[PDB]
Every structure is written in structure tokens, then in C-alpha cells.
Amino acid sequence: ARPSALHLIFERCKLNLVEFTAQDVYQICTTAYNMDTLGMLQDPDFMRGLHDAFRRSDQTVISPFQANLIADTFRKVGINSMPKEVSVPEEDAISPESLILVLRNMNITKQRDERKINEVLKLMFPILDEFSPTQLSLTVTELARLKSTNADFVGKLAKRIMEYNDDLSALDISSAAVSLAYCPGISHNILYRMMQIVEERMGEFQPEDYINVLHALNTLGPKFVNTFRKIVECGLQHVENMDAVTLTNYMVCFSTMDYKQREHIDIYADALVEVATDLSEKDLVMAFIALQRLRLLSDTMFGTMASCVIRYAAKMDPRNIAPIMDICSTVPHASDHLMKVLMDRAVECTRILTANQLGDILDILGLYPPAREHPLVQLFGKQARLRLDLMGPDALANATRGLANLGYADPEYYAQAAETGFRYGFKDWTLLEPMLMGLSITGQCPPTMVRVLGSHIAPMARSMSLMEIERANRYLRRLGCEDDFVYKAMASRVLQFVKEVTPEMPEDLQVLLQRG
């Protein structure tokens, strides 16, 4: 209920009869977000008028995040709003602060523009000597976030920052290190000198400094393993009381650098699994992958981590179903309960999985015994038949192999998969084989299809080994290939190893030697 004064104020706001500045709009939006007694967000005709006032106002007076917050509170109510792009300063307006403000607005409001970034860099080149030590780090961070390709300017900024080592603090050093590590084209000399700087002041580091340094080392790669060494020893005296996410980053770094000292890896993993219950979904997934890649998943290890991942398995992200399915395989441990809920979750989100994720899930579930007696095989067969148009050669191979291994019988899907794979030729035998496995289930195909399949097979027979020769011969005889060239090529390949028709030679091989 709006009394007369409130009703008239609301009407004046609705009719665009009040000249609102950016500050007043920000105050009104903050009041609406804080207290909902007046129901400001429940009046579309009032919020639309406030948005109309927002568009026709001078937004440069407020900070970039204030405009972003106004845009966010307009989006939440249902209004499509975007803060105006700031213009590049001109003539006397070029100052370091004004040029940093353009990058900050581009960051916060998500209005990235390569042309204005280049213009700002060209304007900032001559006056780079007026920057304070903090503004240089702010510029490095802003350019790192915007994914700029001007690595030369970032290298200049890094050199100027590193000239001021004494002034900078540990947090600034870590932020500069990670921002430099994120930029792709930085010369390795600057990275080496920055890592040398990071190597000293090692004990001054805080947990956030450790996280930033670990992120930088993960991005850089194995070439900086020595620096990572100085991390691990420095972390050896604080491992017993350390944050879970820091330990996850440690394990990821151990996996990336291919660390050789196993004692430290075991110590860090044993300390991690104590507090592994405090990890989020993404951190737990990354820790689970890292523990697998380091050959450290013992019975207690896998049991403890699976007990933690079952909690998130109920509402797992589609991007996380396939990894834990991969970790569940290749290990000799019982994971029936985990795989049941994972398969159920994959069933639930079958209509949003991409082609690659669906193919991956089918590939892992291909050889799983309890996956055959599930609705997932049929549902994924229909979904794959729908998504064959969006599948690349790798997705085609994965999905077809997974469906063939699961006993899924559908001649139309296999024929469509073969036709789709005929559009772009099979580079490898591993890509071509799933089509043969799928088509051999029914045992019949048009003569044109087997003729094209033989045309694809015959060149590939000059490198396949004896087991692959036997499998290819089995599939070719199942499909009913009458071409002589392919059998001649396969028999020629066989002769290389055997060189002769051994009496013990498998009866199937003698028929091949006759070149049927």
C-alpha cells in the first residue's frame, strides 16, 4: 500500500519527470537491495523508469563497480541493462589514473574492446615513467584479466615493477607473479627473474601468497620445477596446519611438475586427506584427479575420497561426471555405490550433455558390466542419434565404441554413424574401428557401405599388428566384404611376421592367406 506522498513520488519516478543523477540511482538501488519494505523491485513500471533515468545520466561520476551493480540489480528484476562504455581520454585528460580507469571499467562491466585497449596502451607508452609502484601492478593485473596479447608492454611493466623490489610487499609480489604467469607471450628471462625474486622473501608468504605462487607455477609448467622445490621445502614445516585448498593446489603442482621426491608427495597427500572433507566440488575433483595421476590411490585413500565425493555426486556438475568415472576405473577398488549414483546423475542430465561429454561418458561406461542393465544405454543411444550431427571424429569414435561395448543394438544409428564418419575420413584405426564394431552387431550393411569401408581399411593395413589384422579380418568377414584388394593387403601384412603358413597357424589365418 502506497500512501499519497509515496504514491506521488513513485508516479513522478515512473513518468521520467525527475532528473536523476548516477549517485541518486545508486542510492535508490542500494536501498532497494537492502530493504524491501516498499516493494521497489515488485513494480516493473518503477524499475523501468529508474533504468530509463540510468541510461540518460552521466555515469562517469560513479565508480565502475557502482554502474555494474546498477546493471546487475536491473538484470535481476528482468531488465536488460548495460553500463555505457567510457571514452578514451584525449588532449589534457591523459593521466595514469584516467587510463587505468578505462581498463578497470572494461574489466568490471564486461565490455572488453581490443581497439580501446590498443589505444590506451599507445597513450600509456610515453607517460610510463609517471606511474606509481601500485599503479604498475594494477595495470599488470588489468591487462592480465583482459587476455591482452601485447606481451611486450607487460614485459616492460614487469621490468619496472621488479626494479622496485624493496618497495613491494609479499601480496604485490605474488599478484605480479601470477599475473605475469597468466600472460602467454612474456619472455622467459623476465619470468626467471620474477621467480628468483619470489624465491627470496619465501618465509614472508601468507596462505594467499602460497595459493598465488602455486597458481603461477601451475600455469608456467615444469621448467620452473626448481622454484617449486623451494616451495615444497618451505611448506614442509607448516603442512600439519594448512588450508585444504592450498593442499589441493600443492597436489595439482606435484602432478604437473612430475615431482620425483616421493616422501614429500606422500606427506602432502596424507595431510590433505585429513581435511579433504572441507573441499568444494571443483577442488575435490581436481584433488581426486591429482591423486590418481601420482599413483597414490590406495584402499584407504580411495575409500576416504569417494566417501567425500558421494556427497556432491547427487547434484554433480556435468563437467565432473566423466572425470570421477575415469578415476573409478583403472583401479582395483570397490566403487559400486559411487558409480550407481554417478550413472543416475548422468541419466538425469542426458539432455544437456554436450557431444564430447556424452561420448566420454559412454566410452568409460562401455566395458562396465553393471551399465548394460540400465536405462542409460537406451537413453544415450537416442541422444547420440540426435547429436551425431554435432560430433567430431573423436566424439564419434568414443560414442560408437561405448555403445557397441554395451550391447546396444540399433542398425539405423550405426549406419548413420558410418555415413557421418564417411564425411571426414578416419585418420586412425582407433577412430575407424568403432564403426566396424557397431556394424558387425547386426551383420549386414549395404554393399556400398562395405565397399567404402574396405577402401578405407586397405591403406591402413600396412601398419596394424597381428591382433589388429585378426580383428579387422573378423569384422570384414562379418560385414561380408568381397573385395580382393583389402584381403590381399591384409595377407601381405601377415606374411611380414609369419613369412610362412605355419601348420599351427590359427585356422582363421589360413583362410586369410588364401586371400578370400
Binding site: 607508452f125 610515453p126 596479447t149 601485447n150 606481451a151 611486450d152 602467454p184 607471450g185 623476465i190
Partner: protein
């Protein structure tokens, strides 16, 4: 009688003729003063008074075009010259933005109205397109109509030579900084009259033949219809100035017409010059390299191939001996000339090499010292390798300078 409304593009004379004559005389006096200079302040005073007179005349014309139905009653040649003057006075900075837009909007409206009737001849479409796109005035319907009408090649079959040359020159001069969206339609102007140029191949003069060829090649166009146009030039070398021979070499190289027999004449004509420059030397080196790669060691004349390589090498020596007179503006010219010399095993006297390596030293020193002002790291590595190959005794300063440039890291990378 039918109420036809077709007036010749190039009788039915309105006051627009008088206004355009006044503008023409004012522009003529201004250009005559411009020639006369070669009293700057008094000159600019007269230029200012003429500019004020022209601005008043154009304001009167715009007011008359707005208030009265003059465009409908006007002819068509007057419309063409009105468009010409409206676009030209803007480049001369004699008109403001508001008045220029107001004058051009009604010109486009009247042009579209006449297009709807169909009285737009095959020449007026080209004229309006060339004088609208080069001025970079955008109208969606006008641009789409002109672009769709430029695909009827049967209309553009009997265009006059003067019209072709004027349009080609207008498109060529303003190519340097033209907007990207204006590029494609520009090409559609050139290809519409490509056959008229091709049949007019034996009618152009030598200076304008190269102009047409450069206008077409600078718009990344090498139509087959202009194939005789190049051939005549190949058969008419020796009437070109030595500077023109470099651009002729580049054009012939881009037209797949560059063979061994023309290369000898072209390089000889280049060497007839009084003093070489970077352009002639670079073009000669590129031509020598191109003709060097066209010989097959196992073809029909495989036995004859090595003598041809020796002839190419000797005529490359002819140019290489005169490599100290020129002045290299940028490093890529040096890195191309030296690459050609090394690849073809061309012998170069030590004096020319010393001059060449001395020139680059000042440039790399500028890049290193100034550091404020684009020699990438790969170019510096190539220069170092070249200097090491020829010997470091030639330029002992450049070796230490370039080695310290690598150690410091001044030269950026190609990725950046």
C-alpha cells in the same frame, strides 16, 4: 506524349548551374593562388575570403534545395556536379558537418527517386558510386541499390575513356586510408568497367596504363579482362622512366606475366638510371629472385638451365655493384636485399656491404637508445647471422651493439 523525365548525364538548365559556376570559379582562384605560392599570411587571408564566399553560396544553394522543389525540376548533370562539389568542398574543409549532411541527404533522396524511375544511366551509377563511397557517406538503401546495379555488366559496355580514367583516378588516390566497409564496393566499381578497360587497352597512353594497373592491383584485383593491358606494357618497356620500372616489375610479378626475357630489359632499364634508390634496387632484387625460381633442373631444357642461372646471377651482380648510392628507410629493405644476395650467391663488393651495414647501425642505435618512438627479435637475429656470414670486420660496432640488444631484450617478439 509520355511524361518522360530522362535528362543527359553529361538544356534543362536551372540556377544550380550558376551556383556551381560560382563555386568552380572560387575553387579555381584558390588553386591558382596555391600554384602561385610555389606572403603566406595574405595568401591565407584571400583563401579565407574565398572560403567565406563559397560557404555563403553553398548555404544559399542548400536553402533553395530545401524550400523549393528544385531537385525534381533540375536536370541531371547539375545534380552530378552538385554532388561533386558537396563531396569535394568537405575534403577541402570549406563546409561544416551539419550543412554537408543536409546537402548530401537530399542528394541521396533524389538519386534514389530517379533510380526508382530507372533514368539512372550506366555512367551515372558509376559516377554516383565513386563520388559517394570515396566520401564515405553511408546510406543503406543507396549503397545496396548501387551494389546490386553494379552486377549488370552488360550495361557497362560502351563507357567513355575519360569517364573510366576519372573514376579510376578517383578510386586510386583515396585508397590509402579508406574505410574497410568501403573496400568491397570499390572493387565492384573496378570490375564493372574491367571489360571497357580491356578493349581500351590499345588506346591508353603509357603513363595512364601503369595508373590503371596500379589502381587494379592495389585493390587486390587482377582480372583476366585486363590481361592485354599488362602485355602491352611488357611489349612497350624502354618508354618508362627508371622509377616506373620498379612498379612495373611488381605489377608484372603480381600478374603472372613475369618471365626471364622481360627481366633482362627491366633490370637494364633500371640500371640506366642516374642514381639508384631503395625502390629500384629492391624491385630489381625481387625480380631476379622470382626469375631465379622458374628454372627446372629436369625439364625439357634441363641442359640449358645452368647457363640461365649464370646469366641471372651476372645481371644480379650488375645491380649489386651499385648498392652504396641508395638510402635504406627501414630494416626490411636491407633484410630483403641481403637475403636475395645470399640466397642466389650474388657477389657484392666489400664497399657496398660496408655502407649497407653502416646504415642499419644508426637505425638499431635509434631503436635501442630512444626506446620511446619495430625491429622484432627475429629480424635482429637474421641481421646478426648476415653480419657473421659476411664477416664481423665490416662493421665492428654493429656486432657489439646487436649482441647487447639481445642481452638487454629491447627487441620485441613476433607474437607481440
Amino acid at each position: 506524349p509520355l511524361p518522360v523525365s530522362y535528362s543527359p548525364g553529361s538544356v534543362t538548365s536551372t540556377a544550380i548551374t550558376a551556383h556551381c559556376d560560382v563555386l568552380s570559379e572560387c575553387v579555381a582562384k584558390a588553386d591558382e593562388l596555391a600554384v602561385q605560392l610555389k606572403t603566406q599570411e595574405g595568401m591565407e587571408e584571400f583563401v579565407e575570403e574565398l572560403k567565406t564566399s563559397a560557404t555563403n553560396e553553398m548555404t544559399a544553394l542548400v536553402k533553395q534545395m530545401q524550400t523549393t522543389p528544385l531537385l525534381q525540376r533540375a536536370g541531371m548533370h547539375e545534380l552530378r556536379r552538385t554532388l561533386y562539389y558537396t563531396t569535394s568542398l568537405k575534403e577541402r574543409d570549406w563546409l561544416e558537418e551539419k550543412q554537408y549532411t543536409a546537402a548530401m541527404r537530399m542528394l541521396t533522396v533524389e538519386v534514389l527517386r530517379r533510380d526508382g524511375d530507372g533514368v539512372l544511366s550506366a555512367d551515372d551509377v558509376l559516377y554516383v558510386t565513386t563520388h559517394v563511397v570515396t566520401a564515405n557517406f553511408y546510406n543503406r538503401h543507396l549503397w545496396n541499390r548501387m551494389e546490386k546495379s553494379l552486377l549488370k555488366f552488360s550495361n557497362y559496355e560502351n563507357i567513355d575513356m575519360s569517364s573510366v580514367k576519372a573514376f579510376s583516378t578517383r578510386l586510386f588516390k583515396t585508397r590509402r586510408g579508406c574505410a574497410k566497409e568501403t573496400l568491397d564496393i570499390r572493387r565492384k566499381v573496378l570490375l564493372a568497367m574491367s571489360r571497357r578497360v580491356g578493349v581500351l587497352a590499345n588506346d591508353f597512353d603509357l603513363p595512364s596504363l601503369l595508373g590503371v594497373l596500379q589502381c587494379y592491383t592495389v585493390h587486390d584485383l587482377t582480372p583476366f579482362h585486363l590481361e592485354p593491358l599488362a602485355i602491352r606494357a611488357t611489349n612497350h618497356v624502354g618508354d618508362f622512366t627508371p622509377h616506373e620500372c620498379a612498379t612495373l616489375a611488381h605489377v608484372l610479378r603480381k600478374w603472372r606475366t613475369m618471365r626471364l626475357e622481360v627481366c633482362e630489359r627491366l633490370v637494364e632499364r633500371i640500371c640506366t638510371s642516374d642514381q639508384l634508390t631503395h625502390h629500384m634496387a629492391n624491385a630489381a632484387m625481387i625480380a631476379i629472385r622470382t626469375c631465379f625460381n622458374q628454372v627446372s633442373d629436369g625439364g625439357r631444357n634441363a641442359m640449358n638451365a645452368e647457363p640461365t642461372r649464370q646469366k641471372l646471377r651476372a645481371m644480379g651482380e650488375q645491380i649489386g655493384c651499385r648498392l652504396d648510392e641508395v638510402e635504406y628507410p627501414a630494416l626490411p629493405v636491407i633484410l630483403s636485399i641481403l637475403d636475395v644476395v645470399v640466397t642466389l650467391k650474388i657477389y657484392v663488393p666489400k664497399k657496398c656491404l660496408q655502407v649497407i651495414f653502416s646504415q642499419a647501425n644508426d637505425m638499431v642505435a635509434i631503436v635501442m637508445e630512444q626506446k620511446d618512438d619495430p625491429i622484432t627479435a627475429e629480424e635482429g637475429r637474421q641481421l646478426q647471422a648476415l653480419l657473421s656470414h659476411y664477416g664481423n670486420d665490416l662493421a665492428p660496432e654493429l656486432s657489439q651493439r646487436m649482441k647487447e640488444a639481445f642481452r638487454e631484450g629491447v627487441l620485441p617478439d613476433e607474437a607481440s
